[PDB]
């Protein structure tokens, strides 16, 4: 669904506060996705290790949050902004889009865990909407 100007301002403000820890958030959220929802491990079987805190998890965590960083930059047109990443997911990795909601949830949990004061219900609703829009933008090129 459409992000309001409030949603966008809220996400931009939250990102301002959390971006310094973006690598950690990525690594923790990705590690949690893999352990808590082991169905998602099916896309990562080529990795030597999938355990929390492992090299591949840390490295990929930073890449994923780099995509989230890109999304915040392109928040006014996520469809266009995330086109390349949609093409990669649709045609190279071919990730079932149902999984994007799982990662979204794990990112919210990690944000709440690391920034409890910042993560108010109001921040939560805008971030949840934002991640839902990111997931939709990633799904654009699939079909």
């Amino acid at each position: 669904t459409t992000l309001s100007d409030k949603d966008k301002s809220t996400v931009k403000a939250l990102w301002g506060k959390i971006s310094k820890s973006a690598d950690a958030i990525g690594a923790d959220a990705l590690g949690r996705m893999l352990a808590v929802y082991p169905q998602t491990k099916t896309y990562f079987s080529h990795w030597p290790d999938m355990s929390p805190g492992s090299g591949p998890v840390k490295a990929h965590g930073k890449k994923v949050m780099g995509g989230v960083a890109l999304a915040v930059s392109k928040i006014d047109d996520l469809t266009t902004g995330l086109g390349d990443l949609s093409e990669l997911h649709a045609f190279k990795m071919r990730v079932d889009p149902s999984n994007f909601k799982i990662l979204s949830h794990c990112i919210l949990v990690v944000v709440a865990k690391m920034f409890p004061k910042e993560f108010t219900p109001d921040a939560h609703v805008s971030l949840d909407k934002f991640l839902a829009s990111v997931a939709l933008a990633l799904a654009e090129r699939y079909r």
């Binding site: 590690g31 949690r32 352990a35 808590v36 929802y37 929390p52 949830h105 919210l108 949990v109 990690v110 709440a112 865990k113 690391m114 409890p116 993560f119 219900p121 109001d122 939560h124 609703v125 949840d128």
Partner: protein, 146 residues
């Protein structure tokens, strides 16, 4: 359904230290704000006009505590969750007409609230065990819908 000893220990430990009057209201208010269709069921609970009103609503707060204590029977009877929630399932189905998808959504809100409360203590293992617990409870609550 098959619990390890670590999983049982993790769940007991969460509920052993839980401040129900803190966590319960927070989880329910957050649910009502982030997923506002859940407000459907609380028309007799007074003012829910803005997120501030919801956060300040005493009747919602009291219900948050009641719901959270609703998880107690599961913690004390971890091997018999389906039977323990049988009556609560028909209540939500036949009397309250609560859409059971909302149980899942509340569970996610509770996870976020517990994570914020526990911080570093909400380890990956802790989240694994709590998600498993929630999944079983939410399934049990949906069982008697017909």
């Amino acid at each position: 359904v098959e619990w390890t000893q670590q999983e049982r220990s993790i769940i007991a430990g969460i509920f052993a230290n839980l401040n129900y009057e803190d966590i319960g209201p927070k989880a329910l208010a957050r649910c009502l704000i982030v997923y506002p269709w859940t407000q459907r069921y609380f028309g007799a609970y007074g003012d829910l006009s803005t997120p501030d009103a919801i956060k300040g609503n005493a009747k919602i707060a009291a219900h948050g505590v009641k719901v959270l204590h609703g998880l107690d029977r599961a913690v004390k009877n971890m091997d018999n969750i389906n039977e323990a929630y049988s009556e609560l399932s028909v209540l939500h189905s036949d009397k309250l007409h609560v859409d059971p998808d909302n149980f899942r959504i509340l569970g996610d809100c509770l996870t976020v609230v517990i994570a914020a409360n526990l911080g570093d203590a909400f380890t990956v293992e802790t989240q694994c065990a709590f998600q498993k617990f929630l999944a079983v409870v939410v399934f049990a609550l949906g069982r008697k819908y017909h």
